[PDB]
């Protein structure tokens, strides 16, 4: 039969981090594989 329950922490999924830049140009995040 099954064993003991396991205590666990609820995961926090971190957002993708896009670097902030100064000056006249900037970093852009864009998808490459859409799905319905």
């Amino acid at each position: 039969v099954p064993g003991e329950m396991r205590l666990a922490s609820i995961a926090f999924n971190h957002p993708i981090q896009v670097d902030q830049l100064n000056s006249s140009y900037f970093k852009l995040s864009i998808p490459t594989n859409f799905s319905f």
């Binding site: 099954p2 064993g3 003991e4 329950m5 396991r6």
Partner: peptide, 4 residues
């Protein structure tokens, strides 16, 4: 515990 891991599923049945």
């Amino acid at each position: 515990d891991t599923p049945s």
